Structure formats: structure tokens, C-alpha cells
């Protein structure tokens, strides 16, 4: 059990119901790196960039290989960083390192000196059977001896998306957090990140549509960025709805959504609309044990009514991007994929 606390008040509050204390890196990109070390050298297996920010368990985040927003310069550091750790730790076989990029700064989140649940994905995107190689390494067959020394950079985009069990347990708030709840994953392969994401999304059993009405209800820290997402949705032909606070923000930017009522506000309220199959998309971000408990109804309703909803703005942008793509336009086989690797 983990939780994020925001203020002194919040602290106590936890303490009641409720030990390491760690500063939470707000508005940070989460990254996964799987690598192999034989003592001599380090082979970077894969650099995965999470769609959802740090604070949403790696295990529940979608991720891209290669990174789709991060700088080469920045990867390069993580890369250097891993190597440093691999030797220091005296890693012999697989390892996994988790970072967080904040303001062009790399923070270390944790190191797993073992095989991580990402390996099969990486193995598949890159064509390198990371598990076998690392096994060989463990048995006494260097990377050099194996002929696997260069880091592989795929020609295409591989996106990993998760599948959550919320629908089996309705009483639960289908919301993301620092604790992993997903049961499985899918993979999307595309020429563009948008394509890959689009395939991954569909694969995960998404009910996202390419038209209709979107509901925008984001948190403070998101009010600023939501503008561009709304514009993307609008460009896509979506019609918009927004809860007061968010409507305020959009409007000041030149975007007037239809104002919708919260539950305690009037009628109809979002629930009604959700229930009536009024929306095809919901973007809902929150921040705070209270704000969360208060918005629970949006999420439960959406899940219950099969409306695709995102609980992260990052996730929403990705959803938006994927709108430009067509998951059924092109298929490729694993063999072909790997045949493409130089």
C-alpha cells in the first residue's frame, strides 16, 4: 500500500486510516529501462517511455518503444546512468531501472536487478530475446561471446497498453494510481506513435469513437494544458462539454464548450448524460483524496456505460493523437518487423 499526500492536513488524514516518505515528482515522465550486464559491458535492452506520468504505476501505464517525447540527450543520461548502476550493483543478467524526468532532470525511482515484466514487450519490439541472452550470460556466456552488443533501435513504434479488471469489481473506483491493478497487456505496432497507440488502444478493448461528444473535467494543474487537447478534439469534429472550472479555462482561451452540471449542481448532471449515452469520450483528471472521492461517480458511470475515459491528460493526448490513425489500415507480422531491423 502506497498513497500520495499533498499537504500537512492531508498527511495526518492519511495517518489516521493508515514508513518511507518520498517527495512526489509532480508532472514527471516515467521511464523504464531493461538492460543486461555481464560485468564487462552493458547492453541497453530497451528504453520505454510511459504515456501516463509518474504516480501511475509502471505496471498500469501504457508505454512506447522508442520514447515518443523524450530527448536523445535525456535518454543518453538514463543510458549512462544504468550502466553506472549495472556495474555498481554487480549485475549479472537482467536488470530494470525506473526513472522520472522532471524539468530536463533525471531522477532515479528504483532498480530491479532482475527480470522485469517489460522484457517480453521489449523482446518483441526489438527482436532480441532478452531473456535467453541474459540466461546465457548468467550461465557464463558473455554478451560479446553472444554477439549481442549493440543497442537495438526499431524502425517502427511499439506501444504497450494495459487491461484493467475494474469491470469484474464494480464497487471499485476505476482510477489509476501508484499501485498496480492491471491483469494484462497488449501491443500496438505502427509507423508513427499515433498508429501504434491506436492499435494498442483498440487491442485493449477500448470503446473510444472517432466522433461525438467529449466530456472535459480536469484538475487545476491540468487546466492549462487541457486547452490544446480540447482543440485537438474539436479539430476532430467532437462537440464539447465541460464542468464549470474547466469551462472557465477553455473559454478564456477562445473555446466555449457546453457547460454541464456536476452531480450536486443540478440537472441534468454528468451522470445523467453519461447514462443516456451522451458522450463518446471522457477526459477526467483529479488530484486529492477528496477530489477523488468526489469524482468517483464520473469514472464509475463511464466504465459502467462503456464510454472510453482517460484519467490522465497524457493519456488523453495520446488518445487524441491516435484519432489521426487507422488501426485497420495496416498489418505486419512479427517476422516482417524483425526483418526490418538493421
Ligand X SMILES: NCCC[C@H](N)C(=O)O
Ligand Y SMILES: Nc1ncnc2c1ncn2[C@@H]1O[C@H](COP(=O)(O)OP(=O)(O)O)[C@@H](O)[C@H]1O
Query: 162 contacts which partner out of a second copy, ligand X, Cl ion, none, CB within 5 to 8 A by kind?
Result: ligand X
The distance of closest approach from Cβ of residue 176 to ligand X in the complex, given in angstroms and rounded to an integer, is: 5
Beta strands 42-50; 29-37: pairing state? antiparallel
Beta strands 93-101; 106-112: pairing state? antiparallel
Q: Which residues does the annotation place in the binding site for ATP?
A: 23, 25, 30, 55-58, 98, 110
Name the strand (E) or helix (H) holding 65. strand 63-65
Report if residue 176 touches ligand X, rule: CB under 6 A.
yes
Nearest CA to 301 out of 341, 272, 326, 259 is that of: 272
C-alpha to C-alpha distances, 332 to 17, 156, 327, nearest whole angstrom: 51, 11, 12
Choice between 111 and 122, CB closer to ligand X: 122
Name the strand (E) or helix (H) holding 304. helix 289-305
Report if residue 315 touches ligand X, rule: CB under 6 A.
yes
Nearest CA to 302 out of 281, 328, 319 is that of: 281
> Residue 184: what are its φ and ψ, rounded to 5°?
-155, -175
Q: Are 31 and 47 in contact (CB under 8 A)?
A: yes
In angstroms, rounded to a whole number, what is the distance separating the alpha carbons of residues 146 and 123? Answer: 16
The distance of closest approach from Cβ of residue 52 to K ion in the complex, given in angstroms and rounded to an integer, is: 4
Map grid coordinates 489500415 to a residue: 329
The distance of closest approach from Cβ of residue 222 to ligand X in the complex, given in angstroms and rounded to an integer, is: 13
Please identify the residue of the shown chain whose CB is closest to the bound ligand X. 311
Report if residue 7 touches Cl ion, rule: CB under 5 A.
no
Q: What DSSP string describes 15-55?
A: HHH--------TT-EEEEEEEEE-SS-EEEEEEEEESSPTT
Choice between 40 and 224, CB closer to a second copy: 224
Please identify the residue of the shown chain whose CB is closest to the bound ligand Y. 54
The distance of closest approach from Cβ of residue 95 to ligand Y in the complex, given in angstroms and rounded to an integer, is: 14
Choice between 100 and 240, CB closer to ligand Y: 100
Applying CB under 5 A, the site for K ion has a residue count of 5
Report if residue 277 touches Cl ion, rule: CB under 5 A.
no
- Compute the chain's Rg from CA coordinates: 21
The distance of closest approach from Cβ of residue 215 to K ion in the complex, given in angstroms and rounded to an integer, is: 23
Q: Which residues does the annotation place in the binding site?
A: 23, 25, 30, 55-58, 98, 110, 112
Report if residue 61 touches ligand X, rule: CB under 6 A.
yes
Which one of 70-78, 260-268, 307-315, 326-334 is the stretch in contact with ligand X (CB under 6 A)?
307-315
Report if residue 32 touches ligand X, rule: CB under 6 A.
no
Q: How many CA atoms, within 13 angstroms, populate the side-chain half-sphere of residue 182?
A: 20
Q: Which residues does the annotation place in the binding site for Mg(2+)?
A: 98, 110, 112
The site for a second copy (CB under 8 A) is made up of 244-245, 247-248, 250-252, 256-261, 265-266, 268
Which one of 43-51, 231-239, 252-260, 309-317 is the stretch in contact with K ion (CB under 5 A)?
43-51
The distance of closest approach from Cβ of residue 239 to a second copy in the complex, given in angstroms and rounded to an integer, is: 10
Choice between 59 and 245, CB closer to a second copy: 245
Beta strands 42-50; 157-163: pairing state? unpaired
Choice between 97 and 298, CB closer to K ion: 97
In angstroms, rounded to a whole number, what is the distance separating the alpha carbons of residues 278 and 342? Answer: 49
Give the residues lining the site for K ion (CB under 5 A).
Answer: 30, 50, 52, 56, 61
Give the residues lining the site for ligand X (CB under 6 A).
Answer: 52, 60-62, 161-162, 176, 309-312, 315
Amino acid at each position: 500500500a502506497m498513497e500520495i499526500v499533498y499537504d500537512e492536513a492531508d498527511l495526518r488524514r492519511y495517518f489516521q486510516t493508515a514508513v518511507l516518505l518520498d517527495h512526489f515528482l509532480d508532472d514527471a515522465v516515467e521511464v523504464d529501462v531493461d538492460a543486461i550486464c555481464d560485468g564487462e559491458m552493458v547492453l541497453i535492452g530497451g528504453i520505454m517511455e510511459h504515456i501516463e506520468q509518474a504516480g501511475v504505476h509502471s505496471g498500469d501505464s501504457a508505454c512506447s518503444l522508442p520514447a515518443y517525447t523524450l530527448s536523445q540527450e535525456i535518454q543518453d543520461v538514463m543510458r549512462q546512468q544504468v550502466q553506472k548502476l549495472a556495474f555498481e550493483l554487480q549485475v549479472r543478467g537482467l536488470m530494470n531501472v525506473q526513472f522520472a524526468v522532471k524539468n530536463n532532470e533525471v531522477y532515479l525511482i528504483e532498480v530491479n536487478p532482475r527480470a522485469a515484466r517489460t522484457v517480453p514487450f521489449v523482446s518483441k519490439a526489438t527482436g532480441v530475446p532478452l531473456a535467453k541472452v541474459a540466461a546465457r550470460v548468467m550461465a557464463g556466456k558473455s554478451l560479446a561471446e553472444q554477439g549481442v552488443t549493440k543497442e537495438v533501435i526499431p524502425p517502427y513504434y511499439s506501444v504497450k497498453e494495459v487491461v484493467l479488471p475494474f469491470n469484474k469489481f464494480p464497487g471499485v473506483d476505476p482510477l489509476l494510481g501508484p499501485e498496480m491493478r492491471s491483469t494484462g497487456e497488449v501491443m500496438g505496432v505502427g509507423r508513427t506513435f499515433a498508429e501504434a497507440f491506436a492499435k494498442a488502444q483498440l487491442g485493449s478493448n477500448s470503446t473510444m469513437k472517432k466522433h461525438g461528444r467529449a466530456l472535459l473535467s480536469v484538475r487545476e494543474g491540468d487546466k492549462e494544458r487541457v486547452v490544446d487537447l480540447a482543440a485537438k478534439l474539436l479539430k476532430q469534429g467532437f462537440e464539447l462539454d465541460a464542468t464549470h472550472g474547466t469551462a472557465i479555462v477553455l473559454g478564456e482561451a477562445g473555446i466555449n464548450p457546453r457547460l454541464v452540471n456536476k452531480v450536486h449542481e443540478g440537472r441534468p448532471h454528468i451522470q445523467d448524460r453519461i447514462k443516456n449515452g451522451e458522450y463518446t469520450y471522457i477526459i477526467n483528471t483529479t488530484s486529492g483524496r477528496r477530489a477523488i472521492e468526489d469524482s468517483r461517480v464520473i469514472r464509475r458511470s463511464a466504465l459502467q456505460y462503456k464510454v472510453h475515459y482517460d484519467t490522465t491528460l497524457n493519456g488523453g493526448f495520446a488518445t487524441a493523437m491516435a484519432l489521426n490513425a487507422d488501426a485497420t489500415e495496416k498489418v505486419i507480422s512479427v517476422q516482417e518487423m524483425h526483418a526490418q531491423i538493421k
